[PDB]
Design a binder for these strands. Structure first.
Lengths: 64, 125, 59, 171
RNA sequence: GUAGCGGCGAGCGAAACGGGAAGAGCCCAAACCAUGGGGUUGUAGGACACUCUCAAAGGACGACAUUAGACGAAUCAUCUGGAAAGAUGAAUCAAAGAAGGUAAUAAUCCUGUAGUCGAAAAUGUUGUCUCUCUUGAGUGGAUCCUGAGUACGACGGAGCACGUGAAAUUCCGUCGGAAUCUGGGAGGACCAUCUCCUAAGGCUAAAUACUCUCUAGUGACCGAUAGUGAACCAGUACCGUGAGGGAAAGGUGAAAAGCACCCCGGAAGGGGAGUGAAAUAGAACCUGAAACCGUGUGCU
RNA sequence: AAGCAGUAAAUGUGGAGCCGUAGCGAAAGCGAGUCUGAAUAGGGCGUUUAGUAUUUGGUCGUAGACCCGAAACCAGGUGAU
RNA sequence: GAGGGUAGCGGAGAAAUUCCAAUCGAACCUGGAGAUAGCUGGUUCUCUCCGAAAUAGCUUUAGGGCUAGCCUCAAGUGAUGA
RNA sequence: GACAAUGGUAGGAGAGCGUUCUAAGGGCGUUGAAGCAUGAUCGUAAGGACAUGUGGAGCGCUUAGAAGUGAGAAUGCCGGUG
RNA sequence: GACUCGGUGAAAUCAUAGUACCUGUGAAGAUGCAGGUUACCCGCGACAGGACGGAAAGACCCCGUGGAGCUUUACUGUAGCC
RNA sequence: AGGCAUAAGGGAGCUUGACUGCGAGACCUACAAGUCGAGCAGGGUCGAAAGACGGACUUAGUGAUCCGGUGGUUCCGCAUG
């Protein structure tokens, strides 16, 4: 039994050339009249999965 | 010599063996602490579960698609070159032509290839 | 039990689905009906499916 | 010699030379069971599930033997270096053998004029293996079949003029 | 563990190319001809025209192996012993120093092994010859055939890695319903163009899965609460109306040489006397632990 | 790696395949840079420049998975002495 | 009394959840099956060094879990600690 | 040498003892092995010897390897016995 | 029946027991700790205050994101019927 | 509640900065989130100008993902178009 990947996390995050992951940003699908132009534009970027989340989930993406 | 064998100093270790006495340190509970869902044979919650709080990788939006016709190449720099694609394979450079040998421009210095970086096509001439 | 004397029309078994997709086993009978035909040993009456008695068998 | 590699060569070979045909029966395999003996609640006896559980006698082995292999591998280069180190420590060579008929006394004389001997020949001479397989402490083989356990088990090497050259060609 | 499929959750999860084991392809229905013959396909084949010549199935025919076996090398002496195979000496065999047994621990004591030989007969297979079979092949083409209630569509399902989805490719039930070589199909909806194939009939060994079962063997597999439930007359005592469940039970000694005779006793059981190397090895028989039960006695 | 040879052995052979020396972007695609962007303007991620194979130990995952222990559920039979 | 019949998603009931082999709000036996148990119980040798927590947040959560706080081992920076 | 440290539960790290088997080497043994009984013995512990009885035929020791590798607790299972 | 005598002869229970009272203390109701007071060693018949006496892993209460049976205009389904 | 008579309170003219791409640095913080922000480029409004302006005196007036809809677009579109 090969360890299976988490096929729902491969659709979300990628791996960079340091061993760390490149997630997208939440709160960006609807209800946009309830956010500042700053808060809407600040969310358009992307960020890295924090060290705590590299704790919970690091073997769920071992091939990715 | 077969009756005096010696593995290299530092290679082997004897395994840890729990649940045998209380002078080893891992005897009574065997390294599991007291009662709980994780002190039970059958493991804890599945990894990434997080307890009921919606986990991370189900709380972030999906992203992108994947192209069927992705043409990834074999990257050669101009330091590898200090020239058919085959000779570049039969020297020990391109151990697999994924799509084709593309020549890049990192390093210093004729070439048959399938593409070229800008720096490469400049610094080859 | 019953099946088309001429063709091989059996009954199948599938799932009666739902709107919640709650499936339950059902069958799919063949449109079998009695009729007299000249099995050349003698005129008998047997089951035939309405499909198989569509222009190609004599009664 | 490279003892760090020669140890692993010896250990690898003695591991590979095991059957592993040893088994045992757990709860699923022991005969009978599938019946709770008493009711769990009103008896006064401890609560049990079957008579073929581990704490009983006659039923159930918790873990143990299973029919499983023991061999493993290691890179080609380390294999070759272990063989080179074994021969290197032997160094730390006769002409061709001439035996028309397999006659063990002739071979015993040949070994006395020159008792863990490893007599290494060319491709195969089927009158020297026969002349020599009965003497206790002598092992015969060929240049294509040089073990490391064979070599390191030996107190001496008797390689022909041809086998020396064939192994110098190989390694 | 990729592509994908997934209340896109839990999870499910291919395939082609590539490398290898093994490796053969064939007979029909139709046209046409006189139940039979002819014909079997895609750089189109057959008919028709010339020319040019598993695959059908019954039977005999010497070698190999399987089912009993034969041969099979080479050691004697002292010390202990109850008994030598041991320790101490001298010697031989080895295509044989695997293993077991023998009064102890055996290459040379036995049964064997290395190796060579062996089949009245029965059986399986490989071999030849017999035997049955047997017309091969190109070129042209007006025209005549190439699997129909089939392909396919709608509806409801199943299956494809694929949850009805934009679901291709396959099947099932129900209705409708095609063309015939510039014909039909596929290339993940669909159309065009290209490329590749020819459905709706049938048959095929090997490479592969497994173990009742026979023979030969190995084991850093168990050694009587283990290993099979069953080393023992075990699926048995026993339990149940029944389906069905299910145990405990091995060891004297090298050899029964298994205690003749005497005494107590109703016998059992003893005490002598003998066997024995040992009887506190006396069939409740190798050692014979602990709990437990006693008798005696030093200090209290 | 499978396979073939090999004593159920080493081991020989077997370069299909895998990891690595290049990253960035959803992608086309560029490439020591790249993406966002009108603009390296700024900023994110890169330019560390040694990895790789086998194995010892720790730990995790799929298998019952540290052992014992339910009330229950389903399928196939046996029961009206 | 004898011989028969009805069988468990069932059968019989002058009706009590009453009976169906000393067992019935759904028999018994074998299989799925080592069901599952966030629950109780148990978890076998010695020494040496270090040595907690009983808190925050979220939780179909409240005797469970996940990240952070507090412990340990390795490497490093390097005075940044008191 | 001098100084400093050495309570410890969950837990982290290190060093070890002992059992069965395997390879190699080297040994003991019917002039008595394993085992069992006793003992006033050596080691910091797990433990290791030695001597005498009993016993009757197999066992250590060094170095590695592999584990069905250590029991006082489970209203644990089987036997014996209070 | 019990009681004494001859015969036979269990059982639940059981950490080891050389098993006193009081006033305290204690996980807040002590044979076993403290401080005092009392008691020469062994039986036999009897009583029933304590041993939180014995059997029955509390039928009460609560908790399992545990079961089962029943109800209904709870949800989704279904045999059947039109 | 904290500030405000710099007015942050009142009145009048003019307009749309209730902008596009961003962002050194910092606070808060288990994570996801949340808050502030000089300065830079494109375009402007007010003002004679310096300048101010990326909503409201400050702090509530909000809801992950998945899925569906709509508007664009540079991307992909399973032999090719």
């Amino acid at each position: 039994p090969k360890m299976k990947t988490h096929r729902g996390a491969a659709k979300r995050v990628k791996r960079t050339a340091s061993g760390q992951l490149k997630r997208s940003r939440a709160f960006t699908s609807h209800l946009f009249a309830n956010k500042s132009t700053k808060q809407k534009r600040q969310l358009r970027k992307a960020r890295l999965v924090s060290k705590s989340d590299m704790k919970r989930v690091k073997q769920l993406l071992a091939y990715k | 010599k077969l009756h005096e064998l010696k593995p290299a100093e530092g290679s082997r270790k004897e395994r840890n063996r729990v649940g045998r006495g209380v002078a080893t340190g891992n005897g009574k509970t065997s390294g599991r602490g007291h009662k709980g869902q994780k002190a039970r044979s059958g493991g804890g919650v599945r990894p990434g579960f997080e307890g009921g709080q919606l986990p991370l990788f189900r709380r972030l939006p999906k992203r992108g698609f994947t192209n069927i016709n992705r043409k990834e190449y074999a990257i050669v720099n101009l330091d590898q070159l200090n020239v058919t694609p085959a000779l570049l394979v039969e020297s020990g450079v391109v151990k697999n032509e994924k799509s084709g040998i593309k020549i890049l421009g990192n390093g210093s210095l004729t070439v048959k290839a399938h593409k070229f970086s800008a720096s490469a096509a400049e610094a080859i001439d | 039990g019953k099946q088309c004397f001429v063709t091989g029309r059996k009954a199948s078994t599938g799932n009666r689905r739902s709107h919640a997709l709650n499936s339950t086993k059902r069958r799919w009978n063949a449109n079998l009906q009695k009729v007299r035909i000249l099995v050349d040993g003698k005129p008998k009456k047997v089951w035939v499916s309405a499909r198989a008695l569509k222009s190609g068998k004599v009664t | 010699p490279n003892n760090s590699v020669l140890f692993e060569a010896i250990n690898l070979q003695r591991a590979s030379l095991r059957q592993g045909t040893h088994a045992v029966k757990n709860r699923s395999a022991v005969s009978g069971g599938g019946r709770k003996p008493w009711k769990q609640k009103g008896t006064g006896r401890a609560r049990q599930g079957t008579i073929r559980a581990p704490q009983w006698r006659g039923g159930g082995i918790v873990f143990g033997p299973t029919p499983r292999s023991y061999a493993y591998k290691m890179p080609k280069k380390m294999r070759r270096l272990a063989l080179r180190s074994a021969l290197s420590f032997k160094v730390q060579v006769v002409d061709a053998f001439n035996f028309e008929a397999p006659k063990t006394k002739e071979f015993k004389n040949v070994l006395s004029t020159l008792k863990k001997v490893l007599v290494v020949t060319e491709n195969e001479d089927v009158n020297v293996e026969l002349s020599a397989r009965n003497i206790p402490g002598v092992q015969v083989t060929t240049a294509q079949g040089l073990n490391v356990l064979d070599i390191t088990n030996a107190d001496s090497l008797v390689i022909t003029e041809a086998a020396a050259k064939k192994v110098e060609e190989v390694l």
